Amino acid sequence: AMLPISMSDEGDSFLVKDSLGENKIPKNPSKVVILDLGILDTFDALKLNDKVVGVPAKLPKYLQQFKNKPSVGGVQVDFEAINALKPDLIIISGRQSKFYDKLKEIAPTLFVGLDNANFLSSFENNVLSVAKLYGLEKEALEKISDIKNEIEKAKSIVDEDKKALIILTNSNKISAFGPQSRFGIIHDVLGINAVDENIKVGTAGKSINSEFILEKNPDYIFVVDRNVINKERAQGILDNALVAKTKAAQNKKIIYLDPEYWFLASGNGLESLKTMILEIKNAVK
């Protein structure tokens, strides 16, 4: 299990430990550089927009209120821009853990990792830890309750005898993903059963083809199409007689998920996580 963020109050600051290291973070930080899009959404949802001084502007359609913040990268980190903003806090997730030592020379750097084996507990701890910095625990607990209620509404309507498959299409490559993966919340949080519970743990997933999809005969197929960031599109990759024969194709349950949520992994967002939960619920209702 990923080590959680723990914080102890030391008056003007918190002593913060997370899986990457320890930091003294000032209370109410006022110049925050955020490289994780999900946590940027949570800043919005907690009304902390004025605390943010840098984002990866090179930005999905749901985060356009930050389009005029100074750019610190693309998700490609620009260290010069970061230093020149003189931040009092840098927030990162998985995709930037490789940059940790360099960012930490600039300013205290908080890791809000999403644990693919314990998604909801990581999500809660990330949101509540950011809130504690600002004394917003009450407000963050109300919104965390809203998301839990949405998960319960979504779970309530899932069919126990149907099975789904998750795939990522990248140009013409198809790769399968299962429980406890980067897309795992379809199986792990919303309880939708998988066609294969034993695809191997790892970020690149398992290479598959249409024969595989036919062999599994999924009731639903969830597609994360990284071609939508061209020409070739999952719909054409799956435009064939193998995929056509599948229960998913026959009942028009090939679901194309918005990659600006799923591929960019905005699970740390109070509002973005909600939109993802609703997107699943509305596909299988």
Residue numbers in the entry: 22 to 79, 81 to 97, 99 to 252, 255 to 310
Quote the authors verbatim.
CeuE, an integral part of the CeuBCDE ABC transporter of C. jejuni, is responsible for capturing Fe(III)-siderophore complexes in the periplasm for delivery to their respective inner membrane transporter. C. jejuni does not itself synthesize siderophores, but capitalizes on their secretion by other bacteria, such as E. coli. Here we report a combined solution and structural study of a series of synthetic tetradentate analogues of the enterobactin-derived bis(2, 3-dihydroxybenzoyl-L-Ser), to explore the ligand-binding promiscuity of CeuE, both wild type and with mutations of the Fe(III) binding residues H227 and Y288.
To probe the relative contributions of His227 and Tyr288 to Fe(III)-siderophore binding, site-directed mutagenesis was then used to replace the side chains of the two Fe(III)-coordinating amino acids with non-coordinating side chains of similar size. In addition, the double mutants H227L/Y288F and H227A/Y288F were created. All five mutants (Y288F, H227L, H227A, H227L/Y288F, H227A/Y288F) were crystallized in their apo form, and all structures are closely similar to that of wild type CeuE. Mutation of the Fe(III)-coordinating tyrosine led to a drastic drop in binding affinity in both the single (Y228F) and the double mutants (H227L/Y288F and H227A/Y288F), with Kd values above 1 μM. Site-directed mutagenesis of CeuE revealed that Y288 is essential for binding, as the binding affinity observed in the fluorescence titration experiments is far weaker for all mutants containing Y228F when compared to the wild type protein.
